[PDB]
Amino acid sequence: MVAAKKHVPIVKKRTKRFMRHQSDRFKCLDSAWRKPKGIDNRVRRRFKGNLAMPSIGYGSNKKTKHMMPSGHKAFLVHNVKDVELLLMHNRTYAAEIAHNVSSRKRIDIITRAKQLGVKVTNAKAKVTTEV
Amino acid sequence: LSRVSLARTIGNKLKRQQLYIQAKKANSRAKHEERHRRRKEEAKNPELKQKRLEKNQPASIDKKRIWDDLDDDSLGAVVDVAELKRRRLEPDSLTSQFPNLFADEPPPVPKILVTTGINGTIHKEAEEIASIFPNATYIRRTAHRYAYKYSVREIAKFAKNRGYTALLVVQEDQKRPSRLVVVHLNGEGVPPGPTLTYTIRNYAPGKAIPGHGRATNHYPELLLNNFKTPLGLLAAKSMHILFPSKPELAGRQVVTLHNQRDYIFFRRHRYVFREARPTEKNVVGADGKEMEGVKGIRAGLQEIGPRMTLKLRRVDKGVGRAGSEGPDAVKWEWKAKMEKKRTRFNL
Amino acid sequence: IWRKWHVKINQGQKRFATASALAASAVAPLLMARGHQVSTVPEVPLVVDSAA
Amino acid sequence: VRYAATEIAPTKSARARGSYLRVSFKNTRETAQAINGWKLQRALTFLQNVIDKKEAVPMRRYAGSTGRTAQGKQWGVSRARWPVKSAQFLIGLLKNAEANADAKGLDTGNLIIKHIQVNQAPKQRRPYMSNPCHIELILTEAEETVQKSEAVVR
Amino acid sequence: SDEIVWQIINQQFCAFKLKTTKGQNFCRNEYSVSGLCNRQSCPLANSRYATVRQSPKGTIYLYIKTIERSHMPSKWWEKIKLSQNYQKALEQIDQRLQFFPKFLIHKCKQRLTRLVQVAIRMRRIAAEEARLGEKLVPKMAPKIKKREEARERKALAAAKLERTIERELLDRLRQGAYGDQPLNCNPQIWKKVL
Amino acid sequence: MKVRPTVSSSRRKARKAHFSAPSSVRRVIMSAPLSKELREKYNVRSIPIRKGDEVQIVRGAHKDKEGKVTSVYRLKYVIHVERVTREKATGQTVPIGIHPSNVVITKLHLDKDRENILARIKAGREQVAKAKGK
Amino acid sequence: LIVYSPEHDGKELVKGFRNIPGVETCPVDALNLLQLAPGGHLGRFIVWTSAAIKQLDAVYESKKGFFLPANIVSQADLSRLINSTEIQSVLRAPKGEARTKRAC
RNA sequence: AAACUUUCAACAACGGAUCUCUUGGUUCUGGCAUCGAUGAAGAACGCAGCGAAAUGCGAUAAGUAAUGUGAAUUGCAGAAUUCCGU
RNA sequence: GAGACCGAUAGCGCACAAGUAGAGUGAUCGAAAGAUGAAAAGCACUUUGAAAAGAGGGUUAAAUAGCACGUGAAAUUGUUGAAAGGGAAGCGCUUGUGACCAGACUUGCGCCCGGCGGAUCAUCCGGUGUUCUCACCGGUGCACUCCGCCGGGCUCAGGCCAG
Ligand SMILES: [Zn+2]
């Protein structure tokens, strides 16, 4: 038994990103959400068949907020000292090795997390196995 | 402009570009007339064309190869083995160090076992590698995800008991074959011999190759090309030991391992001998062109095998590093310091 | 140029702030909360002899 | 995983490039599409006939209504013209790749044009703008297939 | 002044504070029972404190800090060896953290629990890794990979692979390596060779 | 740190002065350490290089290569050494540039001004050691 | 931060500590907040001298227009204020617990 | 069925954004007081083997005298010009 | 001499040929334009052919850094592959099909029997440091105790989806 702790089921209220209006048509508008402000904008008045707005009712359950599908919360780790902070929380958190960590330092982190029983999200990036 | 950089002598960028454009128009015009006057004079007197060609010849990294200008062979010395015997007339170190590969008579029908990396997912790539070598079977390393984690040392003991000759492990990266570990199990009482790990870089299956074909069960003919060093002679004999010694020369299947500058290019073709088509040129040989006796017939080729490029990284005494236990446990270990100069070819 | 670069602070508030910083320097938790590797000195005010 | 279609071997291939060619990009694109996937000798006769005003080049994408001759019955396109400079630049590029194939030792009578591609060159800065082009092309031998042996039972 | 020390650490700044976006804060102090920045488990704000740490020789020690020696951080913690017997080691915490806050008693037992299972987990995966003999090693560096990708391209052109195969195959037919009446070739082709 | 007001800690003024220097003060910049034997005999650490100096390269890809100076190129801050050369495409061998800080001087080219340089450094080094000692 | 007495120690100590990275020197008559609280964070490590501790009473007496401020709280340990015999003797019984059981 | 058009991906173009750099600018502070009829500031004409949309100089013309340093100049030609020496 | 300034569409108009190039009869107006590489080692030689261009081959750690030169975005364009369409289609909700990609609980603890070895075991000896009762070494041994390791036996707990 090495897994996450007993958590209530993760329910995502909406799995699709809120896309900015008319971002599909104009390349200058990024898809990042901007609230419409024209008084005759059909998205703003919320007619049917249009894009929905983000709202606090979409907010995820506070027990399962920030939880990965396995049940863990991601923890950004830069060296071996950061993994040891997860010694008491090896069932709630998972080690996410930062993107600017070298090859050798990753193997030191990956070895340490195995000894501590801490899940690593990216354990096969700059490494390989030699027999 | 060959000895001076216009960037480090003219600070204004735009003035430098026009002077270089004027340089390109001048030199390209000058080279055209100089080569055209040479072509005019070559037509009258063709002897000077023979003199120009033999004196001015293009450079080659192969012809600038650096050998260890010394004696001795120790599986780490870059030296032409064949030129050493020719100098001696005017490899004992390999046979003593590796009695099993370089013995008198190999086992007649080698039995080969191919397995994958542990909890691997490259089953279709490993089975095609198993079809490369005749009399080879594929067994997955782990049955389930949560199954027993058999070691390479164990499987080498298991397959030697059953009667296999070699054990091949294809190690994966990015769900693609990346390393080939070749283990020699041998027979009777001698221990499992040397382990040769390689790197599979440009893997392409036969299905990806346009105009390919199937392979028949005929034993192929082995072509081990351009192996000269003591290390290369071991890599050549190791690939020799996997294949049957007597080829069934009716399937017309050829498996080649060509060593160009420590890159072992692997192919598998099938051929037919045919008369040359009238617009086709005769097959030339190097230094002795217009290959005699064979004049006017050409050997066609159709690929039937995987594309891959191998490079030798480590050779060990036993099975892996953990399995080679003496003080000569690592025989030759590739490091990037050896490829520091482009004319140092290890094998 | 005539942006307000310098700030007038009352002298009483400056001396209050200096008195608090001196008092915080006599507290051993506040030394290591400030990043000082202070685990070897044998007294946290650390008065040395003037003759040395 | 998936594996892309690997490249046909370089020693069975022949390459030629043309960069910054003072020739119209819209015309050369239409001329290169006419001869894509043809034999080498088929293309050199066609491009020479375009030079001699005998056979016309159909206009499909960058098509302008200029001529409606019966020569378009062999293409099915009702718009036709005679690109002379585009034929001349493409002829010298095809002859270059034929010389490259003979240096590499290829069969002169069996090259096909599997790859032709026309890009745009930087505009010549003079209110009027010229439109030069880059052209690259690859020739290969026709795929040769050999016979299989009869499989042996054992 | 333990409440005042907490007000500076919590609201203003602590050098041992790691802040994540996941909703919990972490304490980087090596003398913390739980790596969290709450009031009950701050080594700084709590003048009387306990923790459990592991020496690289494998010995688990109980570190106790008292207020009466807080002015000298050199003589701050007292190190007390814990037994290898687990139920006996739990009793030393109960005996020696007597009359302490229940949180510190509880978190010292749990840190004792985690450290003992890690040692068992260490010895299990060390035995399994010594069995397989596989070791994680760094992959090829970007510059070396760029070098072998470039020098393989030049080796592939210099090989002239399908020409070399044809050259070597025609060499063997000439030299009689295929034997008389070969299954390789066509009999109207051999009569050309003589 | 710096004290005197005439001294500047400007990276801009330092980089301008280094790369726009006259050849007289390029000479002082273009200076090399002396060997262990030469240090214990002349009591001098570093002198500028001249053409006749036998030298040894101790940094770079041409490490442990010994030779005589062939040229002191002050415009590109380069010395040239005998038999430290590379081939061009044409085959012509060209000198390879070593900075003066990458070499150690083995044998000096001695003339009257050079002994005066070596005396003045020894006089100052002896003076301050005596002033520090007593 | 080394704090010294220029009247009894001299300024020769300033030159010895001047090259050592990090360490700073300040006389006891001219204490600096930018050095006592670097970055606005309190708790500087200070290496006092014995002559400076004697002067510390005097330099803060000689400051005209200022006296050492009186705190608005005499006992800053709040646990002593609340968990005392005098406070806890007078309190009402606790109306509940820290966690309340869900009724319905 | 071709073609044509659309979307996506790989590769190849066009273009010069982004990141990084800086012998440049901007602003502040400090020491000091010096153009010209003994012809200034400015404007030309010339002086180097190949030289400008540079710089230096003035028929002694990329400079001479004098002092100091102490072995170069350098993009290529080219100097029996100089090395215990005005 | 400096800076909580700007960083090549910025900062003086000018980081570079900048009051230049260019315009106007004239007074005047007045730009654009930085970055190869550590070092030119700035692509020898063969072969196309009329060119600011290729194919080989070479230098270099790298030439997809080749004086169009650090990185090299988007608009826009070509080739290859998949799919669709005929004044359609584009966005929202919901499946389906195909292609590509990913890969679920990281999968363990506890008892009993035998052997081996270390200890925090021994009212064992000696030494060191200390907050002065706590730690750490060195040498002894296995009567007791406790840990490991190896070889057997047994039990339990395990993530998700259905019924
Ligand atoms: Zn804290």
The DSSP result for E22-84, as a single string, is TS-EEE--TT-SSS---GGG-TTT-SSEEEEEE-TTS-EEEEEE-GGGTT-STT-EEEEEPPS
Query: Parallel, antiparallel, or unpaired: how do β-strands B176-184 and B166-173 relate?
Result: antiparallel
Contact predicate B216/B268, CB 8 Å: no
The answer to whether A48 CB sits below 7 Å from nucleic acid chain I is: no
| Cβ atoms of residues E148 and B203 within 8 Å | no
CA distance C16 to G72: 14
Asked if residue A40 belongs to a known ligand binding site, the reply is yes
Whether E13 and chain G come into contact, CB under 8 Å, resolves to yes
**Residues tagged in the binding site annotation of E for Zn(2+):** 37, 42
What's the gap in Å between C35 CA and the centre of ligand 1?
12
As given in the structure block, the two tokens for residue E189 are 């082709």
Cβ of E161 within 8 Å of Cβ of B265? The answer is yes
DSSP letters along E102-122, please? Answer: HHHHHHHHHHHHHHHHHHHHH
Sign of torsion, CA B52 B54 B56 B57?
A: positive
Contact call for residues A81 and A34 (beta carbons, < 8 A):
no
G42 and E CB contact within 8 Å: yes
Cα–Cα distance, B192 to B208 (Å, whole number): 36
* Residue E150 DSSP label: H
Specify whether the CB–CB gap between A118 and A3 falls below 8 A.
no
- Rounded CA gap, B127 and B177, in Å? 12
The interaxial angle of helices B13-44 and B47-55, nearest 10 deg, is 130
- Measured in whole angstroms, the distance separating CA A62 from the mean position of its chain's CA atoms is 15
Of the candidates E3, E8, E12, the beta carbon closest to that of G76 is on E3
Specify the amino acid at residue B122: I
CA-wise closest residue to B193 among B156, B152, B218 = B156
Cα(B83)–Cα(B64) distance, rounded to whole angstroms?
16
Q: Which of C11, C31, C45 sits opposite G43 (nearest CB)?
A: C31
* Beta strands B176-184 and B195-199, pairing class: antiparallel
Among residues B285, B170, B67, which one has the least CA distance to residue E168? B285
- 3-class DSSP state of B92: helix
Which chain D residues are Cβ-neighbours of E160 within 8 angstroms? 11
Residue G76, CB-side half-sphere exposure with 13 Å CA sphere: 10
Q: Report the DSSP beta bridge partners of residue B254.
A: B221, B269
- Whether any strand I atom is under 7 angstroms from the Cβ of B17: the reply reads yes
CA of C47 to the centre of ligand 1 (A): 28
F42: three-class secondary structure by DSSP: helix
Strand A119-120 with A93-97, pairing: parallel
The C-alpha R_g of chain A, in whole angstroms, comes to: 21
Q: Which two tokens stand for residue A31?
A: 């898809």
Distance, Å, D27 CA → H3 C1': 18
Q: What is the dihedral of CA D64, D69, D74, D75, to 10 degrees?
A: 10
Q: Are A100 and E101 in contact (CB under 8 A)?
A: no
Distance E112 CA to ligand 1 centre (A): 22
Measured CA to CA, the distance from residue G25 to residue B343 in angstroms comes to 61
Closest residue of chain A to B324, computed from CA coordinates: A131
What's the half-sphere exposure (Cβ side, CA atoms, 13 Å) at E166?
A: 26
Between the alpha carbon of residue B150 and those of residues B125, B180, E128, the distances in Å are 20, 18, 10
Buried b (16+ CB within 10 A) or exposed e, E119-143: eeeeeeeeeeeeebbbebeebeeee
Indicate the burial class of E192 (C-beta count within 10 angstroms; 0-12, 13-18, 19 or more). middle
* CA–CA distance, A11 with F55 (Å, rounded to integer): 76
Q: Does E134 sit within 8 Å of A131, measured CB to CB?
A: yes
Give the relative orientation of helices E102-132 and E86-96 as an angle to the nearest 10 degrees.
150
Residues having C-beta closer than 5 Å to ion ligand 1? E 9, 14, 37, 42
Strand order in the sheet with B112-116: B136-138, B112-116, B166-173, B176-184, B195-199, B312-316, B330-333
Contact indicator for B161, B107 with CB cutoff of 8 Å: no
